[PDB]
Design the sequence.
């Protein structure tokens, strides 16, 4: 006898322009690959978390962070027919920076969605 | 790039043997083939193959036979499936690691085994 499992772990990082929550063209191949693996691992789920740099009104950044996570989700749901209930979204506004908000470069890093996908088969 | 993707494989194989024998019996061949299939789909995976005996008969016979059983499973992957030999370790433990009661025929049959763990990622 023989038993086997395969475990999926994926991290997707999507970055955004100031004030924007669109998915730039360059990320579309990475979203396609996430969709492919959610089909290959049908029990898989994703936790999609969106973020802003620390500029502009708090209320703007609460919305924009969630809008960025939702744009990612929407791309999977609408363009790849991924079931919505497998993908959670949350926005964290500026509360979890990964880089220096003092520089243009650190702010571009903070304007992001990180999605973690896990599954097994 | 903007994505990290890992798929981890964990697979367990159990093969059991007739007394004094290290040949692979036919009923085990579909499983060994499925192991070779995954070692191909995960070309970085390796296998730890461990052979064992029941506690009957001379000590050195069991030392040799336990490693012979582990080597016979390795030999099937290497020779029939062209798995790279350096990816597979073999080790015999004679009767030192029983999984069943050596006082019965059925327990002795469970101890005459090779257990292999195959792990890796792609
Ligand atoms: N011009 C805008 C930039 C804010 C949006 C920013 N926090 C982002 O993450 O894209 C302002 O400073 O009010
Ligand atoms: N009839 C042999 C059997 C010994 C090998 C046995 N320990 C095995 O694991 O196959 C003897 O008693 O010397």
Sequence:
């Amino acid at each position: 006898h023989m038993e086997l499992t395969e475990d999926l772990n994926m991290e997707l990082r999507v970055f955004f322009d100031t004030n924007k929550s669109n998915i730039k063209d360059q990320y579309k191949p990475e979203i396609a690959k996430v969709a492919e693996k959610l089909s290959e691992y049908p029990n898989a789920t994703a936790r999609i978390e969106g973020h802003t740099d620390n500029t502009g009104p708090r209320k703007l950044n609460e919305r924009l962070s969630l809008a960025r996570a939702n744009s990612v989700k929407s791309a999977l749901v609408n363009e790849y027919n991924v079931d919505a209930s497998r993908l959670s979204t949350q926005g964290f506004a500026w509360d979890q920076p990964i880089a220096d908000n003092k520089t243009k470069e650190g702010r571009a890093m903070n304007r992001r969605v990180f999605a973690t996908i896990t599954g097994s088969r």
